[PDB]
Amino acid sequence: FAFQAEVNRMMKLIINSLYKNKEIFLRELISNASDALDKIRLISLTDENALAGNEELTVKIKCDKEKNLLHVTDTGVGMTREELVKNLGTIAKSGTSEFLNKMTEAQEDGQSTSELIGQFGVGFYSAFLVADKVIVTSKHNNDTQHIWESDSNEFSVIADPRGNTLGRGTTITLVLKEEASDYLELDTIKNLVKKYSQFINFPIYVWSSKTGKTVWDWELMN
Amino acid sequence: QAEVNRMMKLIINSLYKNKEIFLRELISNASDALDKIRLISLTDENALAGNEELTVKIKCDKEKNLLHVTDTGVGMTREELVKNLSTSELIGQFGVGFYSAFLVADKVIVTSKHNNDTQHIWESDSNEFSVIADPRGNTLGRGTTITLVLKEEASDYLELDTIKNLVKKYSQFINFPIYVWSSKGKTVWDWELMN
Ligand SMILES: Nc1ncnc2c1ncn2[C@@H]1O[C@H](COP(=O)(O)O)[C@@H](O)[C@H]1O
Ligand SMILES: Nc1ncnc2c1ncn2[C@@H]1O[C@H](COP(=O)(O)O)[C@@H](O)[C@H]1O
Ligand SMILES: [Mg+2]
Numbered sequence A: 001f002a003f004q005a006e007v008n009r010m011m012k013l014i015i016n017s018l019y020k021n022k023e024i025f026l027r028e029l030i031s032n033a034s035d036a037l038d039k040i041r042l043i044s045l046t047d048e049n050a051l052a053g054n055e056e057l058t059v060k061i062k063c064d065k066e067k068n069l070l071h072v073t074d075t076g077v078g079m080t081r082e083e084l085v086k087n088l089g090t091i092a093k094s095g096t097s098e099f100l101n102k103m104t105e106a107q108e109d110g111q112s113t114s115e116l117i118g119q120f121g122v123g124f125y126s127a128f129l130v131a132d133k134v135i136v137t138s139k140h141n142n143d144t145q146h147i148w149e150s151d152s153n154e155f156s157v158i159a160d161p162r163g164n165t166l167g168r169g170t171t172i173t174l175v176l177k178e179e180a181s182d183y184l185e186l187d188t189i190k191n192l193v194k195k196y197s198q199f200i201n202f203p204i205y206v207w208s209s210k211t212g213k214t215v216w217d218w219e220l221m222n
Numbered sequence B: 001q002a003e004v005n006r007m008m009k010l011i012i013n014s015l016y017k018n019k020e021i022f023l024r025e026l027i028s029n030a031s032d033a034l035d036k037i038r039l040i041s042l043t044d045e046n047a048l049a050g051n052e053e054l055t056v057k058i059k060c061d062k063e064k065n066l067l068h069v070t071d072t073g074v075g076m077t078r079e080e081l082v083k084n085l086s087t088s089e090l091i092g093q094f095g096v097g098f099y100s101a102f103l104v105a106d107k108v109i110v111t112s113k114h115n116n117d118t119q120h121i122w123e124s125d126s127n128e129f130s131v132i133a134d135p136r137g138n139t140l141g142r143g144t145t146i147t148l149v150l151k152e153e154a155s156d157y158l159e160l161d162t163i164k165n166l167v168k169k170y171s172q173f174i175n176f177p178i179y180v181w182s183s184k185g186k187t188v189w190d191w192e193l194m195n
């Protein structure tokens, strides 16, 4: 079924073109990080032990020029394997089959083209506006650490062989597109994070340089 | 179709078969993988650069109830893991092929590294399967590790002497050495040859 795949991918490449200011993806990822942090914070006000796997409550963003990666890590509630499968799996299933079904369903619901274009700019899915592949590493108090991966067509999830390295929380890793290389520039990231971190009740940091030789460390953005 | 497939499956399993032959099938597969790369090395001088040995190593992990069968053969790329790993399970029911692993395993995890790709991890319970790049990086050098999460019934397959005799039984005509991680002489561990 390679033919339909060329149609599916092309349809996406075009919808993305409608978004000249894709920066919205960073706002949505920060918003999800914030919700996950509020959830574990609320739970901690009832059960102090709930923070046992990792005592801090933060969002840490880092750029990886070499691998062409953008990492967004929060120490929030995290997701179990089933959650990765149900909460992200279905949302990231925009392949030939899924895309067409939702399309004809779009005719049924009578949704407008605007309402279609709009779905590409909100929530977790907005990550694809700038990424070819998205990798999610998560650790929830009720499960072992897992890795989920998707290219917006298929998705797979397996137990992280490195074991529990997060303690608790989630890392969203974005494999950026060539045209999104901008989101690898230290100053662009700092500007956008500072822009969307104003109403989050948790410290958000960006890995940056300071200044002996030059040193790199977490710089507070809000 | 789903009707005949199920009928045959119930039937096939009705006849007796020693589940032990699952190892036979894996060793068989390791031997082939090693043949494929060994031959290639006769034409590509640097073919074995990733791992300078041609072996089959078997390790027991009672703790996690795991059984590991690692070969330094040709390996599989992401694409091959998906393509090379249905009528398959049915064949496995008879006790032949990769799927025979499920005769003693609830889950099968396959870690593989091929010269033309990065290390990937494949996992399945026979119903569904997933595959992703190994976050640990290229740890195998080249080759494949079949990780079996054994069923309660197959708990005995984690006894040194059991696996040793089992491997010793199916290694007589393999063109490559096969080892089993064992102890022996003040409580020391290392690889012990079998064939
Ligand atoms: N960083 C995260 N931590 C925990 N859950 C998340 C995170 N990001 C997304 N999710 C979950 O996946 C779903 C999809 O995200 P969204 O499309 O923004 O609603 C949400 O309802 C969350 O439950
Ligand atoms: N250890 C291995 N190394 C490389 N390829 C393997 C290995 N085990 C199985 N395969 C591949 O997957 C297929 C399934 O195994 P089988 O059912 O024995 O045919 C084989 O035809 C091989 O191409
Ligand atoms: Mg959201």
Ligand SMILES: [Mg+2]
Pocket (backbone or CB within 6 Å): B025, B028, B029, B096, B097, B098
């Ligand atoms: Mg075979």
